[PDB]
């Protein structure tokens, strides 16, 4: 059984990982290939295994959010191609070209003065570009036909970079009104067959990501990038309730009761602003996570958490390290005794898209906001470890 | 200049820390010493760097969340007290008492079974205990003077452990009406007077927080727990308003903008949802920063950044790692412009106080979520360093 000094850990089940795998391969065309999407360290679920486990399972490519996100993957002995998604600054051609890491550009100064900086110097291997078209999003890319050529004639006459992919993002494929997303669809086409129409041969084309992915399988060209997905979790409600592919979740929160006290005497306030007043026969049970974990403040007074199959309330504010619950008047319970923060208990569940709900935000910002001070635990074929 | 891949980064002012420090000092009586409170990765500024400067200028003590907490700052060749706030796990009596980190705890029981752990491996130390008196915060400590008593002759009639304080913590230290606070201060001193009674000598004596501190200075007995107000952040508007002390907000986050682009062109929709649509001439910049870094998601067409001494609105949704804001109609910027997010710049700020309001939470949540994978910059003596 987990020994910790701090009794809260998360578990990560590397099973449902490669089920989620092979659902999304199942859909998607057999020639099309998986990016796996492990930026802001796995979505909070631990970039490295889920990266490993993804890789052995059918994803070929992986995608982070920084070099720097990138490089703890090459510590770790990750050889396949990794696609930076944001902006890399010119400081870091030269690292990133040392560490085999594809980034991402769309801008011809951007091409030319990165292939300056590697032409400079004893430079053995070009440095591998993907292009962001931006069709849509608004964020990163470029967005005519006209510049779009420029860039890749750039690129082409950059003999120290070399052209790897050309992709986009939609930035509404999980909605139930599709019109945009078919007019992006639509656009991201139309500058690839005017690229083509130059006499251009095409890098690896992708543009899905988990919801069009799953609601537009025939858009999954060469390659779709997964994330949501792979962690089991859905893009949206209305994604999930398409019913067209079934994810498991990989990640539950859990702890253990640090202290169980009956609330006797006086006073029976409860946490920060005594928000809360305990009954004299209720039974306050103390657990070690707070909103420095990513447990958010706001479910003071608000959460539950799971204790003997059943959902007990957070009781009065949450605090940095710690919150409080009751077990009820008398709420049996141990010191020492397993609580499920996010998951599955008996049959009782608190999921994350239950607990975004809550708090009107997403299942995506819940996982990635978990803190690095939470250890991590892996489920592979049904044992645990790391 | 500061180099990174991507360019989003913290700057933690140490000689505001110095100052804010020596703010609290000179307000406490003269034989009190401090305990600067560095839990949760220094409340997201870095434990070590913090608790280094802390001991420089004024403290004579640490306090963490975790044993591993205590061990990250004994392997940076910290050798002042440390004492872990929240509850241990017996399986790290052993390693505890070996890195010389002080437990509190509270119950007879684990008193009883720390020193046999310590007694069954010949442990070559005596672990330090503190005892929690819990006299309203209801989350952890001995709640009854009987009780009390009792843990007090466990802990004494254990050779193997080591008696170097007792505390209470202030629930409601921090707001207006002070009946509670005055009640637990009661309370504490009638418990320690009942061991006196009993012939019992006390170790160091603390109850203060950072609001208690400033509001009840004549409490400080034989030592406080500066937190908050080590980081130049007030625990409350109240003790603000009080204005006895005055302190200067350490942490500042900033960024350099990634693309700066014009809306030309059709679709002019920003970020997922398309929640936000530009004018044809307007500009957008985007900048490195979303909510996997602890960038809240409820900023999302609400927040500011400070941009050339201005602040400029967030345009749509904040991404996992990235957000958009507006420079307006024919805006000025630059790609690799600095943008202030957390602040101040030129005369503008936007504090982490009045981002705390906007999110309807606290100044504490706000930066003790702030991600490990933004890497923290330190100025001292008006100089950067890491
Ligand atoms: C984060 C991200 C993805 C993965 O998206 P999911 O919606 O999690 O599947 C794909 N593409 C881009 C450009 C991203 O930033
Ligand atoms: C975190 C903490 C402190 C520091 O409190 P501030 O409000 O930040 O000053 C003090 N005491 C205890 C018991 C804590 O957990
Ligand atoms: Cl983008
Ligand atoms: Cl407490
Ligand atoms: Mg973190
Ligand atoms: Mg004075
Ligand atoms: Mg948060």
């Not at 019109?179 to 086409?189: A, G, S």
Request: hydrophobic content about 45%; some cysteine; aromatic content about 8%.
């Amino acid at each position: 059984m987990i020994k910790l000094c701090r009794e809260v850990w998360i578990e990560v089940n590397l099973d449902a990982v490669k089920k989620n795998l092979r659902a999304i391969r199942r859909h998607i065309p057999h020639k099309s290939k998986i990016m796996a999407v492990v930026k802001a360290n796995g979505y909070g679920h631990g970039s490295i295994e889920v990266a490993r486990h993804a890789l052995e399972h059918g994803a070929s490519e992986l995608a982070v959010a920084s070099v720097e996100e990138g490089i703890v993957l090459r510590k770790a002995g990750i050889t396949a191609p990794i696609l930076v998604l944001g902006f890399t600054s010119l400081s870091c051609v030269k690292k990133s070209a040392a560490w085999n890491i594809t980034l991402s550009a769309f801008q011809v100064d951007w091409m030319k003065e990165a292939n300056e900086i590697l032409e400079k110097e004893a430079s053995a291997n070009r440095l591998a570009i993907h292009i962001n078209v931006d069709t849509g999003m608004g964020r990163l890319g470029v967005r005519t036909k006209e510049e779009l050529l420029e860039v890749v004639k750039a690129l082409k006459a950059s003999k120290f970079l070399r052209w790897t992919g050309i992709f986009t993002h939609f930035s509404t494929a999980d909605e139930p009104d599709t019109t945009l997303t078919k007019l992006q669809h639509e656009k991201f086409i139309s500058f690839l067959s005017f690229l083509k129409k130059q006499g251009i041969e095409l890098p690896t084309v992708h543009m899905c990501n988990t919801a069009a992915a799953i609601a537009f399988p025939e858009f999954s060209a060469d390659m779709i990038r997964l994330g949501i997905g792979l962690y089991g979790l859905y893009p949206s409600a209305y994604i999930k309730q398409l019913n067209l592919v079934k994810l498991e979740p990989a990640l539950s929160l859990k702890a253990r009761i640090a202290y169980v006290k009956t609330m006797r005497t006086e006073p029976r306030t409860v946490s920060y602003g005594a928000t809360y007043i305990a009954e004299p026969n209720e039974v306050i049970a103390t657990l070690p996570i707070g909103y420095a974990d990513g447990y958010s403040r706001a479910l003071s007074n608000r959460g539950f958490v799971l204790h003997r199959g059943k959902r007990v309330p957070v009781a009065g504010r949450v605090t940095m390290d710690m919150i409080m619950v009751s077990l009820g008047e008398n709420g049996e319970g141990k010191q020492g005794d397993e609580v499920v923060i996010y998951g599955k208990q008996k049959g009782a569940e608190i999921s994350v898209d239950e607990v975004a709900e809550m708090l009107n935000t997403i299942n995506y910002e819940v996982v990635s906001t978990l803190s690095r001070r939470i250890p991590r635990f892996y489920i592979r074929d049904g044992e645990i470890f790391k």
